């Protein structure tokens, strides 16, 4: 039971956080203009199935 | 005590801050949260902190209060109308209030 | 029959800090370059500054321009061919006693 | 081979792109852009970009690491605010207002009429007005008339609050004013409505605090 | 026993299996095996590429059950022929196409099993419709860091196809591995049909578009071409004596004479000539 | 004539950048 807690923490370590932002507009089908909350703007894309 | 889920209470004195914006930014977030849940109740006791009437170009700190006050005068009537949003207001003296309110 | 020069210069130039120390300089170059000339003014400084009221508490950039106005007029004209004309309401606010 | 050469340059975009705005140009194929990272640079530009797209202070794309001009965006992209979108007409008919027949007729010709009869002003020498101001006691139909005119128009309509550009940053205020007015120039015959300019248009002075 | 100037042969089916699996799994590394034959001690030849079911994170990707693996190769033997695994591949999306610290860890796993196991890097993001950024690497020992690793009896893998890029030698070249060259072998049968897949039937060659819109398009283009000529009279006459690089800085902006004027003439030419000439043949040929 | 005042704050913005050639694993 205590080993099960350790194995959950082995899985938990390699998680990486994600940037939170807001979509400004849709440029093309795969180009999007978003903006980070702290500042600047970017040109991004989705994955496939969003 | 009837609803207990859909009731917003504001002290109307912790709205102020040290920055220049950031007091309006609470009020926009409040009504937008009141926009999302549809049958909302707003309660602001003791408006007389934020309420006031008007000053003839006094302190710049008064201008921060009046700009904060005019966001209420906008977003009660303004462009976007409201639906199922009720606002209870309470005070001790009503004479010191803005006649536009 | 003199070259008229109207300076509006109301407050859009009062904010301009970095060039605020030259706007009177080349203007008085322009007056002594073109012709016997006449420069016209208005209420614009009195709305900007009067005296040391906005003094040691930040200098407000506008009275410092007024000290450069007083600097050149102290320097040398003897009118030489050039008058300046100023017209105002709200007459009892500015620093005219030093300027008398 | 030159048309094969143009296509092989195009790997430089690849969309991790950052967004700036064009500012000025020095000479042939070298310019100045102002980034949205706060700072200001001196960059190089591709020979591919058609030079007709420049100077509205256009929204432009930039490289991450090397920070060069790579792409010219559509000009309405970096705006951060939208117009009256598609359906938010506030459901006020023109005949809903009762008994404002002087002022309803006056504002209606103040907005729509110089789109057609522009040269009648100059032949008289009127110099037609850019803007109009409304005022009165609180609740004499100031907002409703502006509310009704959005329903029975076809032009672009941008509602503007009094005091939203007062954020606690350095100069976001004047940046947002540029974002509004470029959007009005870009779109159409447009209408800008700024309710409650009393929050900003004050008389007093610059108190240095 | 020594290396040489090696050469990676391909199959044309492989590269399309490379990028489409890479593009459809874009925001992470997607993995796959590589399937070919060791034709000599000098060159290597891949003919087939297939993937496996996987499970990924934002920073790592893993495979799942190996019961898919041997059963996949079993049913590829009985249909066609048996063949040989030669290596593997994955993606580095938007990266500098370089072997990562986990990518190198699966290579002493693979080089100990078979010798010339090739690691292959693809990127479907820095690849434009003109050209593909394909990449392949080959691990070297650290025990032979002083002794020579290639005998270098020719020039073909030394100064050709590039000098190594600055964003890839910052991790790799020539530490811990060495790069390898890639070409494209082509059978004649697919070469003949890869040539002709953008052509149509005779229906497309004998259309007459429609004379209403064709006259409308000519009515359209000439009308603004009048206005381009209005602006063209002003600018050519203007010519402020400005030492024309200053002419070449006041023209970036809205300025465009002489550029649309060559353009619309080309459009009005090629439209009207083909519309006439195809209408010529439909009377000479037909009846 | 004898009147006090309060104050306010205008906080500056902040931005950061790197060469971005650093990998973040080292685990495994
Ligand atoms: N002529 C009219 N016909 C119908 N309703 C009217 C008329 N004039 C005013 N109203 C009422 O006034 C409101 C219109 O908005 P309002 O007049 O409050 O904007 P305003 O004058 O800017 O007010 P405030 O200055 O307080 O913001 C509506 O709620 C409507 O009930
Ligand atoms: Mg109103």
Can you tag this structure with a few keywords?
part of a larger assembly, 6 chains, A: 50 residues, alpha+beta, three-stranded antiparallel beta sheet, 1 helix, 3 strands, elongated, C: 100 residues, alpha/beta, three-stranded parallel beta sheet, 4 helices, 32% helix, binds adenosine-5'-triphosphate, binds magnesium ion, metal ion binding (chain E)
Could you say which structural class the secondary elements and strand pairing of chain E correspond to?
A: alpha/beta
- Beta percentage of chain E is 15-25%
> Numbering strands along the chain, what is their spatial order in the largest sheet of chain E?
9-8-7-6-2-3-1-10
What is the general shape of chain E? Answer: extended
Largest interface, counted with CB-CB under 8 A? Answer: B-D, 22 and 22 residues
Work out the radius of gyration of chain E. 29 Å
Termini Cα gap of chain E? 76 Å
Query: Helices and strands of chain E, in N-to-C order?
Result: EHEEEEHEHEEEEHHHH
The amount of beta strand of chain A, in percent, is 25-35%
Largest sheet of chain E: 8 strands, mixed
How do the helices and strands follow one another from N- to C-terminus of chain A? HEEE
The level of helicity of chain E is: 25-40%
Structural summary, described in words:
- The structure is cut from a larger assembly and holds two copies of chain A, one copy of chain C (100 residues), one copy of chain D (209 residues), one copy of chain E (287 residues) and one copy of chain F (28 residues).
- The termini of chain A are far apart.
- Helix content of chain A is 24%, strand content 30%.
- In chain A, strand 2 and strand 3 form a beta hairpin.
- Chain A has one helix and three strands, in the order αβββ.
- By secondary structure, chain A is an alpha+beta fold.
- Chain D has 209 residues and is of the alpha+beta class.
- In chain D, the strands form two sheets. Chain D has a five-stranded antiparallel sheet with strand order 3-2-1-4-5, with no helix packed on it. Chain D has a two-stranded parallel ribbon with strand order 6-7.
- In chain D, strand 4 and strand 5 form a beta hairpin.
- Chain D is elongated, with a radius of gyration of 23 Å.
- Chain E is an alpha/beta fold and 287 residues long.
- In chain E, the strands form two sheets. In chain E, strands 9-8-7-6-2-3-1-10 form an eight-stranded mixed sheet. In chain E, strands 4-5 form a two-stranded antiparallel ribbon.
- Chains in contact: A-D, A-E, A-F, B-D, B-F, C-D, D-E, D-F, E-F.
- Bound molecules: adenosine-5'-triphosphate (ATP) and magnesium ion.
- Adenosine-5'-triphosphate (ATP) sits at the interface of chains D and B.
- It is classed as hydrolase.
- The entry lists the keywords Proteosome, hydrolase.
- The entry is titled "Cryo-EM structures and dynamics of substrate-engaged human 26S proteasome".
